[PDB]
């Protein structure tokens, strides 16, 4: 029996069959509702477009994100997301396949209660599992120990794990990730005269962010280079055919990851979050975490983030020992890859959560079972 791995992230749901390398179904988690009036009677005008249909027809759709800041706020939208990812994308019965799921650190318990009750009452499964995203990312990195900076669409959380023991007190969370970068990119594009106010325009600005933005290695030198010469300006074609050109906004937008005072947050950058996570660990195991800085999440896809990250930690940490950044090319799907690693294990048959365990112990055995 093939299991299913389905990371229900804040940004994009990534699902597929276990024992595989790549997720078959990657699609954004939006629920699109029409805001205008229908006049054309017939042809299946369905009232709530989900996923890729909501992405394609997005010019008449108010888009809602069910997962906001790593928390499932809207639940009926999340049920529609789960219905689309099981029935339309994978096209598999839930009652004959195990389904691995993922979760953010320091989550509310009633969130886990509700996800367990949906995964055992509505979408009945033989077995399922909830894991921390950083733990699965460390598993797909092939190492039992290390510190994981996972930066999704709403949450950038730092989790150090030593020998499979995820340290709970040293985990911290910073609410600054990709959607905040998209909103800041909407704000700073109005200096060039481009207005993006609708939720349909958020996907266009997000595509601009995905395609053109990059992490500066030194911010002040990139200010000097951008103000001096217009060599780093890059042009983008909008879906209506218009072409914009952006300059310093390719690297002022990810610099919010290192300077949260741009959007007005008193907390420092992700480097200081990583370093303050490191001092919360034991002094014996800090050496291993320095050489094992693993990243995951698509907010780490900018092609200057590793060298800048190593520079920031090496500035922060003492230079007596070694600093190393673990940045695999497939760290976007490393949550899914670690789930596929964990699902097809011979030991993992005895850590499954059965329906009999659900019936005996409510939707509450996930607290005492999982970390």
Ligand X SMILES: Nc1ncnc2c1ncn2[C@@H]1O[C@H](COP(=O)(O)OP(=O)(O)O)[C@@H](O)[C@H]1O
Q: Which residues bind another protein (CB under 8 A)?
A: 113, 117, 121, 358-359, 362-364
The contacts of residue 193 (CB under 8 Å, 6+ apart) are none
Asked if residue 178 binds Mg ion (CB under 5 A), the reply is no
Question: Whole-number minimum distance, CB 73 to another protein, in Å?
Answer: 19
Binding mask 146-165 for Mg ion (x = CB under 5 A): ------x-------------
Binding segment for Mg ion among 4-12, 87-95, 157-165, 362-370 (CB under 5 A)?
4-12
Question: Whole-number minimum distance, CB 113 to another protein, in Å?
Answer: 6
Question: Whole-number minimum distance, CB 297 to Mg ion, in Å?
Answer: 5
362 contact choice in another protein, ligand X, Mg ion, none (CB below 5 to 8 Å, kind-dependent) = another protein
Question: Whole-number minimum distance, CB 362 to another protein, in Å?
Answer: 6
Contact 158, 172 (CB under 8 A): yes
Asked if residue 9 binds ligand X (CB under 6 A), the reply is yes
Report the candidate in 12, 5, 116 with the shortest Cα–Cα distance to residue 367.
116
The contacts of residue 207 (CB under 8 Å, 6+ apart) are none
Q: Which is nearer to Mg ion, 16 or 152 (CB)?
A: 152
Instruction: Tell me how far apart the alpha carbons of residues 180 and 197 are, in angstroms, rounded to a whole number.
Output: 14
Q: Which is nearer to another protein, 306 or 361 (CB)?
A: 361
Contact 208, 246 (CB under 8 A): yes
Asked if residue 105 binds Mg ion (CB under 5 A), the reply is no
Instruction: Tell me how far apart the alpha carbons of residues 296 and 138 are, in angstroms, rounded to a whole number.
Output: 9
Residue-level length of the chain: 371
N-term to C-term CA, the chain: 26
Instruction: Tell me how far apart the alpha carbons of residues 84 and 27 are, in angstroms, rounded to a whole number.
Output: 10
Asked if residue 178 binds ligand X (CB under 6 A), the reply is yes
Quote the tokens at residue 200. 């349909």
Instruction: Tell me how far apart the alpha carbons of residues 287 and 292 are, in angstroms, rounded to a whole number.
Output: 9
Nearest residue to Mg ion by CB is: 9
Asked if residue 9 binds Mg ion (CB under 5 A), the reply is yes
Asked if residue 66 binds Mg ion (CB under 5 A), the reply is no
User: How big, in percent rounded to 5, are the helix, strand and coil portions of the chain?
Assistant: 40, 20, 40
Asked if residue 80 binds ligand X (CB under 6 A), the reply is no
Q: Which is nearer to ligand X, 152 or 269 (CB)?
A: 152
* DSSP run (H or E) holding 224: helix 219-228
Instruction: Tell me how far apart the alpha carbons of residues 349 and 342 are, in angstroms, rounded to a whole number.
Output: 10
Report the candidate in 78, 90, 102 with the shortest Cα–Cα distance to residue 16.
90
299 contact choice in Mg ion, another protein, ligand X, none (CB below 5 to 8 Å, kind-dependent) = ligand X
Q: Is 55 helix (H, G, I), strand (E, B) or coil?
A: helix
- Contact pick of 157, 202, 206, 252 for ligand X (by CB under 6 A): 206
Asked if residue 252 binds ligand X (CB under 6 A), the reply is no
Instruction: Tell me how far apart the alpha carbons of residues 48 and 34 are, in angstroms, rounded to a whole number.
Output: 7
Q: Which is nearer to ligand X, 12 or 119 (CB)?
A: 12
Binding mask 276-315 for ligand X (x = CB under 6 A): ---------------------xxx-xx-------------
Asked if residue 332 binds ligand X (CB under 6 A), the reply is yes
Note the residues at the interface with ligand X (CB under 6 A). Answer: 9-12, 152-153, 178, 206, 209-210, 297-299, 301-302, 332
Note the residues at the interface with Mg ion (CB under 5 A). Answer: 9, 152
């Amino acid at each position: 029996t093939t299991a299913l791995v389905c990371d229900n992230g804040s940004g994009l749901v990534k699902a597929g069959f276990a024992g595989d390398d790549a997720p078959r179904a990657v699609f954004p988690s939006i629920v699109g509702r029409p805001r205008h009036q229908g006049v054309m009677v017939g042809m299946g005008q369905k009232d709530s477009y989900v996923g890729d249909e909501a992405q394609s027809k997005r010019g008449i759709l108010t888009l809602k994100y069910p997962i906001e800041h790593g928390i499932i706020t809207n639940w009926d939208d999340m049920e529609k997301i789960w219905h689309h990812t099981f029935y339309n994308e994978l096209r598999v019965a839930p009652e004959e396949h195990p389904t691995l799921l993922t979760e953010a650190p320091l989550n509310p318990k009633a969130n886990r209660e509700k996800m367990t009750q949906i995964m055992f009452e509505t979408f009945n499964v033989p077995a399922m599992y909830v894991a921390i995203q950083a733990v699965l990312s460390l598993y797909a990195s092939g190492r039992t120990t290390g510190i994981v900076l996972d930066s999704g669409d709403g949450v950038t959380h730092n989790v150090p794990i030593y020998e499979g023991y995820a340290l709970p007190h040293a985990i911290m969370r910073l609410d600054l990730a990709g959607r905040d970068l998209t909103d800041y990119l909407m704000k700073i594009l109005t200096e060039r005269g481009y207005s993006f106010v609708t939720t349909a325009e958020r996907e266009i600005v997000r595509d601009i962010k995905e395609k053109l933005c990059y992490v500066a290695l030194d911010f002040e030198n990139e200010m000097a280079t951008a103000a001096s010469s217009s060599s780093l300006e890059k042009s983008y074609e909008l879906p209506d055919g218009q072409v914009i050109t952006i300059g310093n906004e390719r690297f002022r937008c990810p610099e919010t990851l290192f300077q949260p005072s741009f959007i007005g947050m008193e907390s420092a950058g992700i480097h200081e979050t990583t370093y303050n996570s490191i001092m919360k660990c034991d002094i014996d195991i800090r050496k291993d975490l320095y050489a094992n800085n693993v990243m995951s999440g698509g907010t780490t896809m900018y092609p200057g983030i590793a060298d800048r990250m190593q520079k920031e930690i090496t500035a922060l940490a003492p230079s007596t020992m070694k600093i190393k950044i673990i940045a695999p090319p497939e760290r976007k799907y490393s949550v899914w890859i670690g789930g596929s690693i964990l699902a097809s294990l011979s030991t993992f048959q005895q850590m499954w959560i059965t329906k009999q365990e659900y019936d005996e112990a409510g939707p509450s055995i996930v607290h005492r079972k999982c970390f």
